[PDB]
Amino acid sequence: APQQINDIVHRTITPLIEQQKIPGMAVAVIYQGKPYYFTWGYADIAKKQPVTQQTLFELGSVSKTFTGVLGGDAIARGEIKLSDPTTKYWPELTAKQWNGITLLHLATYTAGGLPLQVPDEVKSSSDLLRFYQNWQPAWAPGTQRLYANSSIGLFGALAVKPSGLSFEQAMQTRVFQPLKLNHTWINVPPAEEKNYAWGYREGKAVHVSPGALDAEAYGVKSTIEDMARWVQSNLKPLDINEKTLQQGIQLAQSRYWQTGDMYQGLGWEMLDWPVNPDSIIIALAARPVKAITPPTPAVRASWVHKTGATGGFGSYVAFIPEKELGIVMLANKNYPNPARVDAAWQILNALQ
C-alpha cells in the first residue's frame, strides 16, 4: 500500500463519508494492475458489524456491466447476434412496434423509449409478455437513448435463451466462475448472510426488493475484493484464458452510440481520456444518439465507468485501460452521483 495511494484515498473518502453521512464504505484502487483495499464504518449499524473486504454490497445498476459482458460472451459463442430482431428469441412478441427492434437496441437503451422500471404489478412470465406487447414506443428504434431497466433487463433474458441455462446459471458458469468471483451473487446464499450489508434509506435498514428482470438489470451483490477483480478483468481482457469471455469483455466496451462526449457500450459507458469530471457528470433524460457505424472496438485511452444504485446502496466503478488504473467505490447509502464521480476522478487524477 504505497503512501501516495493511502493518502489520496483517505484524504478524498473521509470527507465524502462525513459530508454524505455514509454508514459504511469499501474502496479498491487498481494501480499498475494491483489492487489496494480500504474500508470504513458499518455494514450493520444495529449489530455494530464493520465493513470488511468480505462485506457484500448491492451493486444496483453496476450489475448491468455483468449483463453486458454475459451478452458479449453469448455473441462470441455464436448463440446470438446484436443485429438479430428481438422477435427471433421471443416470437410471442407479435405487436407491430417490435418490427425493427434488435438486441442491440435493447442492450443500449435505444429501442424507442422503453420505461425506466418494469411495473411492480408485473410478476409472472405472462405478465411480462403482456407488458412488452402493450408498450407504445415514443420514437423509432435507434434514434434516442433513454436509460431503462426494462430495456437491458430484456436483453439479458433473451441473450441467455439459446444456452438453455437460467440467467443465474449462465452468469455463474460463464462469468463469475471463470473470473474467480466466488463471493459475487444474484441470490445471496444463507451461508453468506452474515456478510451482507444493510442498505440505509432515511436511516431505515433496507435490502433490494424482488422484481421482474431484477437479476438482469440490478440484482448483483459483491465484495470489494471481487469487484477489484472484475475491474482487473475489464482493464486487461487478454489475460483471460476463456476465449469467448475475453471477446465478450471487448464487445461490452465497444462504442455503439454517441451522445455528447459519451459513448454507450453494453452496460459500460465510456468517454475519451483525458477528460474533466464536469464532462463526466433527473428521473428521465431523453437524448438523441448518433450511431457509430460500425462500432469502435474498445479504445484503451478511455474513462470507462458505471454508476449504480439501489434504495439503500450507491456504487461506482471507473477505469482507464491505457494506464492500468481503476477504482471501485461501494457504499450502503444511495448518495448523489456527482459526488461519486468527483471523488473517483480526484483519486485517479492524482495517481495518473
What resolution does the deposited structure have, in angstroms? 1.9
Burial (CB < 10 A; 0-12, 13-18, 19+), residue 241, is: exposed
Return d(Cα 228, Cα 232) in angstroms, integer. 6
> All 3 cell numbers of residue 151?
430495456
Q: What is the CATH number of the domain that holds 97?
A: 3.40.710.10
Number of domains the chain contains: 1
Return d(Cα 245, Cα 68) in angstroms, integer. 11
Annotated binding residue at 133? no
Range of the domain at 215: 1-352
How many alpha carbons fall within 13 Å on the CB side of residue 341? 16
Q: Are 76 and 251 in contact (CB under 8 A)?
A: yes
Q: Of these residues, 61, 63, 150, 151, which one is catalytic?
A: 61
Cell numbers 464536469 correspond to 278
Rounded to the nearest 10 degrees, the angle between the axes of helix 149-159 and helix 63-76 is: 40
> All 3 cell numbers of residue 262?
459519451
**Known catalytic membership, residue 61:** yes
Technique used to solve these coordinates: X-ray
Return d(Cα 169, Cα 190) in angstroms, integer. 18
By residue count, the chain amounts to 352
> All 3 cell numbers of residue 260?
455528447
Q: Please, what's the largest Cα pairwise distance for the chain? A: 61
Return d(Cα 229, Cα 326) in angstroms, integer. 11
Burial (CB < 10 A; 0-12, 13-18, 19+), residue 310, is: buried
Annotated binding residue at 334? yes
Closest CA to 348 of 340, 265, 226, 40: 340
The secondary structure of the chain, three-state, reads CCHHHHHHHHHHHHHHHHHHCCCEEEEEEEECCEEEEEEEEEEECCCCEECCCCCEEECHHHHHHHHHHHHHHHHHCCCCCCCCEHHHHCCCCCCHHHCCCEHHHHHCCCCCCCCCCCCCCCCCHHHHHHHHHHCCCCCCCCCEECCCHHHHHHHHHHHCHHHCCCHHHHHHHHHHCCCCCCCCECCCCHHHHHHECCEEECCEEECCCCCCCHHHHHCCEECHHHHHHHHHHHHCHHHCCCHHHHHHHHHHCCEEEEECCEEECCCCEEEECCCCHHHHCCCCCCEECEEEEEEECCCCCEEEEEEEECCCCEEEEEEEHHHCEEEEEEECECCCHHHHHHHHHHHHHHHC
Cα 7 from chain centre: 28
Which residue type occupies 197? A
> All 3 cell numbers of residue 176?
463469475
Rounded to the nearest 10 degrees, the angle between the axes of helix 125-134 and helix 149-159 is: 120
Return d(Cα 105, Cα 167) in angstroms, integer. 20
Annotated binding residue at 309? yes
Annotated binding residue at 89? no
Annotated binding residue at 149? yes
Annotated binding residue at 147? yes
Closest CA to 135 of 109, 157, 108, 115: 115
DSSP bridge partners of 140: none
Which residue type occupies 274? P
* Number of C-beta neighbours around residue 205 at 10 A: 16
